[PDB]
Ligand binder design. Structure first.
Ligand SMILES: O=P(O)(O)OC[C@H]1O[C@](O)(COP(=O)(O)O)[C@@H](O)[C@@H]1O
Ligand SMILES: O=P(O)(O)OC[C@H]1O[C@](O)(COP(=O)(O)O)[C@@H](O)[C@@H]1O
Ligand SMILES: [Mg+2]
Ligand SMILES: [Mg+2]
Ligand SMILES: [Mg+2]
Lengths: 518, 518, 518
């Protein structure tokens, strides 16, 4: 048996687990989008091509580092790699570009005569933190400059301060004027320009600084597809990001990175304001106790699934693959369970940005996601997504759930959907069919943005518009058929579901046909 | 808040029951078919016209009584009453004609007119039973004739003989070559030609007698829509009726009447052989202990529902309405519960054949069914019907379950289906939408046979066949749209689901559209 | 709200996830067993006392390395540490000792001279594998010795050979009688005595070698509690381990390590023969594809849960904590998901055997387990465990399921169970209450082995048997009460469930009492 067919049919979740079978191969199609952070290890056109071949759907540019020039040259490379495959439109893969905001980071200064090395702090040793910009590049084991000028208002005597992915912790002992004396609660090698966290501090930095607006305006000029907004704390932060993109940026997706207590606490208003969510587990597990992160992850994934908005699970998914050709058993399990929880995308960071095995990392994500997608208990998931979704009068929403139901009923090879803006296809994605959603569009950005949604295999029609609209609709369906055939999603005799609108509109999807693939 | 909608959203059946509301009005549409037995109280064109106006769908002719000439006239009156409404294609109701077989009945003879009226059978009195035809019409307290010639072979001293809906019982005290001396165990008033039951005696009467053959052939000739075959004990019994119905009877639905121990015991084969089932409770409740009838009733309804085959609940649903303009509380509950169990149609016998309130009984059935249909727990029923149904490759099957799903999602006004044979619509009905299924057909037989399925409101198109097939389709669609508007099923506000096919075949339904009503 | 109680009351698993709350504190009790591998980092009496305080339940001795003398000292220290708390019976924790077998391992030899230390294998380089004992302690980048004398009988040209947690890979270019020539495909640096894997080779080493025989007998004289048997392929393997243990080691629990393809395939036979299972992910994810491991883990946990037999999740759970004081986000997730899957115990290897932060690794496991236990969807799990158990039994199984039900109904502080051999506490565990199960016993081996079962907090009663049974019962019950109170599991006003035999006996635990705590 294939596709965990035996397990799919169990009357209990327990029995479903018992029936999971190592020797049952998955379907060819992989549903979960893969986002990769591009940096010095993956920036070259040639490796970028392999990455796309290995499965990369979205290139993330981390604006916490680098320069406009650097990132512009990265974007150009992504676009050369991507376009190198346009000669064959049946096999061309759209690739989205995402701008990841710096936001309200606190960084440390430079280490003495930098970067001549690093320092060592020791448990019990004491440290003065100064705001005095004299020490800006004079940081050693005795004094450390930070760039957050209001730090003294916000912390108190006993406050913990984490430095560098939270591996070092200090505790404020002597407070003071515009400086802090602390005892190293937890020591280690301290380098230059490291991140600082102040869990439970009322930190007043904005989500959107002047420098964030300049980055965002750059993203609009660079025609990126999406924005990952860092440290969003309330809806009004999301609205600032969107408004500031202006009319030219109107269709860029806003993804809120939830990465602090207030973000989780205000999750619902943030979700309502956003196009989607990223569970930014890195900062999230320093900001709140690490034992609690999986709770926040499952919470957010549930709510985004319940709302039909994309959710990305991020950070350290395969961390050890920075240095090694295989992941840890923890990492393999982490990716799989993110898929099983319901994440639309999984993300790689250091493992593609800077590691020695970017290509192996991407493949691993692809390989795990597709085993995990077969392992999903669709029986319970579909039922629960139905129950929990409201009665509406939008005919697209009605056609979408109807098509997903039909697809389960006939076990079809795909759901094919024509879409101008993405929406019809996103509506189908919401109900989590097992079959891949082939979204045919002419809008290239629609194609790129479709990767945010579980299940949507976007396809960019290049053919000119027919003047008989009915014939144009057909050209597109047949196009989707050739792609599925060429990719192995289905064969000549199989059946598929095709969603179509009644007029050439723009939001009129309302027709579902069950057809054999020619 | 209308149609038990608060109840419909409950997560448990118990909470659903708690939320049932006496002030929440149902939809206009009524989904359960009403079968009325036609005889002396209901036979004239005038009263037949009121019966249709009242919700009658099927006219049953019971061939345990009358001559062919009598029945020909009844059918002709039904047709006249039905056709009287043809002058307005929108408000016309097809009416089906059903032929109910005598089968292997045992009955007593005629009481001596004197004119005593009825004979008084007294507990402990002796009563001779004879087979001598000279006594056929000379029945009284001392001598009772019976038309089952073998009776003496199949009972023994001490056997029990039941007479008249099982109200009178006799014990065999003495056995003879062509007579029986019995003692009255259960006394009462005995009238003429009463039903006799011998539970657990080994009755050897053929399933299809010469008289039945005659009646079946006349039904073919007369072009009846369906036959209710009495005392079906096994699949081969059904085969005889089908044989005897032959090619000209190709399309007559055979409905097997389950009314003895064997019929229940062999139920699965009879169900696979038949086009439908009738739970024939009158005899059933004499052939098995009466406290067990509800168990038989609910297993047959359950299995027919699981098989997607029409089942009919019959007999004493509103018995007391034979004499009274309003039913007993047990009668109102009985009708409601039959619908609630999933019966496709409910039936009236004496209440329309001979009663003083034929029209009130029909109205009462229409009123209770519509109330009960609003109280069904569809969340659970729809979920269980899906689980239990197999994955097929039949595009029409996929389409049907997709349309029902869409119908719940947008609270649809109706599911409009174009069908020639009826199948496409039968396939929607087996998934039990709440919304009426308006089947548009040009085939008149198909429109009459549709009444056998819960929720199909057949509609007969009379319009000329347009030149262009796509415009002919659209015409049938606009037809159904007008009829639902005319009758208050829905307004320009609403949405309806339209099912359609890709070619003027004859089994190619593969298209569902979700459409705001123009 | 506490304890994710709001999430507990959800109608769907999806809504359950939606309600998972970062600010909802868990209970004090932690149910999942913690197994720690003792090694150079953890072996001192002083470190071991802190491990017990931080949460260690089972000390694991890995007989893949070390001499018997070494292990006997580790064992003696574990007992010195454990017994140093026996002076307060209220706070004493039984600590089990487990022996983890070497089994049919394949290892490389020692590097160097002259090496020095590591040796860099280069992608594309050629490496000769030899079997000549002259090279046993002379390995380098050209020449590698292995201790598997039949390797040559059993790989082929183009077979893959993996070295050191599958991080280095070699392809066989040329075979030969007692050597192999190979090409490095995944390079890296190769240390001494690394594990070798031949996936898809029929490796023919015995289940129980002479060394294993000697190790198991040593296990018997040291009085260990359990044996983790490596590389169990089939039931006769478990039977061989049982024969060595013999009559004298009768009560020692055998936990079969599933770590190769044949073990997964013959899982059901192995589980029937075993006392529990370890999912040994390290070797397993090299033997089968790493993407597949999560599937095997979940199938094994499900089937062990359904059988009521202990299951352990092992290997790389908090790996990065060997060198760092906080785990990665993948690591935190992996631990939570293992507990959410249904695992009875979790395990630490290098992180407590050799790393810089053994105490923090224990604490973290303790913290996550307890967080994950509050997040379980008990409403579904209990329903499923009851449905998959037989409606048969056996008053003892009925009482235990009745106890677990009462325990939810009143948010019991604990279920107190009196047991000689553990069995009755085992029975309660298999139904997965959320409340801790305080198992009171006078048998010290029973108390130590109890840690194999989720939720069983063993408590060793040292008082002599009282003159009246009823006072003997109350003594032990009251002792459970005091331990619960001292540990913060519950207080004076709370209710606990107490399970007991009817007669002074042992098993036949058929009595349940719901009692307030004094
Ligand atoms: O998903 P969206 O943006 O609503 O677009 C769906 C639209 O695409 C179509 O199928 C085709 O329209 P175009 O030919 O204008 O692209 C419409 O019938 C439908 O309204
Ligand atoms: O339910 P049935 O008998 O299969 O008929 C459904 C058929 O009716 C149609 O919708 C219309 O066909 P006609 O124009 O032949 O009536 C077909 O496309 C479809 O196959
Ligand atoms: Mg950033
Ligand atoms: Mg009859
Ligand atoms: Mg070992």
């Amino acid at each position: 048996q294939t596709q965990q067919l035996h397990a799919a049919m169990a009357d209990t979740f327990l029995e479903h687990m018992c029936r999971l079978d190592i020797d049952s191969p998955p379907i060819t199609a992989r549903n979960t989008g893969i986002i990769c952070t591009i940096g010095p290890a993956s920036r070259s056109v040639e490796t970028l091509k392999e990455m796309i071949k290995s499965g990369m759907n979205v290139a993330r540019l981390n604006f916490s580092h680098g320069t406009h020039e650097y990132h512009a040259e990265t974007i150009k490379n992504v676009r050369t790699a991507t376009e190198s495959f346009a000669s064959d439109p049946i096999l061309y893969r759209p690739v989205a570009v995402a701008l990841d905001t710096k936001g309200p980071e606190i960084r440390t200064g430079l280490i003495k005569g930098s970067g001549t090395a690093e320092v060592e702090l020791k448990k019990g040793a004491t440290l003065k933190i100064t705001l005095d910009n004299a020490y800006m590049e004079k940081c050693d084991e005795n004094i450390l400059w930070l760039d957050y000028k209001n730090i003294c208002k916000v912390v108190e005597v006993g406050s913990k301060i984490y430095v560098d992915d939270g591996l070092i912790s200090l505790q404020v002992k002597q407070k003071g004027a515009d400086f802090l004396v602390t005892e190293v609660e937890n020591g280690g090698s301290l380098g230059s320009k490291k991140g600082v966290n102040l869990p439970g501090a009322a930190v007043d930095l904005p989500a959107v600084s002047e420098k964030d607006i300049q980055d965002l305006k750059f993203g609009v000029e660079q025609d990126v597809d999406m924005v990952f907004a860092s440290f969003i704390r309330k809806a009004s932060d999301v609205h600032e990001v969107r408004k500031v993109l202006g009319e030219k940026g109107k269709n860029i997706k806003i993804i809120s990175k939830i990465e602090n207590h207030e973000g989780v606490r205000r999750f619902d208003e943030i979700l309502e304001a956003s196009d989607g969510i990223m569970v930014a587990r890195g900062d999230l597990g320093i900001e709140i106790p690490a034992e609690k992160v999986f709770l926040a992850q499952k919470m957010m994934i549930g709510r985004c699934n319940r709302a039909g908005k994309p959710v990305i699970c991020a950070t350290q998914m395969l961390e050890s693959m920075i240095k090694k050709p295989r992941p840890t058993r923890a990492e393999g399990s982490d990716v799989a369970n993110a898929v099983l929880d319901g994440a639309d995308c999984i993300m790689l960071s250091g493992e593609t940005a800077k590691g020695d095995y970017p290509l192996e990392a991407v493949r691993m994500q692809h390989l795990i996601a597709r085993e995990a997608e077969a392992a999903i208990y669709y029986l319970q998931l579909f039922e629960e997504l139905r129950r929990l979704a409201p009665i509406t009068s939008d005919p697209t929403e009605a056609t979408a759930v109807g098509a997903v139901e039909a697809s389960f009923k006939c076990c079809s090879g795909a759901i094919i959907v024509l879409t101008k803006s993405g929406r019809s296809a996103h509506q189908v994605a919401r109900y989590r069919p097992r079959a891949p959603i082939i979204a045919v569009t002419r809008n290239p950005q629609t194609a790129r943005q479709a990767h945010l949604y579980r299940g949507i295999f976007p396809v960019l029609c290049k053919d000119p518009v027919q003047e008989a609209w009915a014939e144009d609709v057909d050209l597109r369906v047949n196009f989707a058929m050739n792609v599925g055939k060429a990719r192995g999603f289905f064969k000549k005799g199989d059946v598929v579901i095709v969603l179509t609108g009644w007029r050439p509109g723009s939001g009129f999807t309302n027709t579902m046909r069950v057809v054999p693939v020619p």
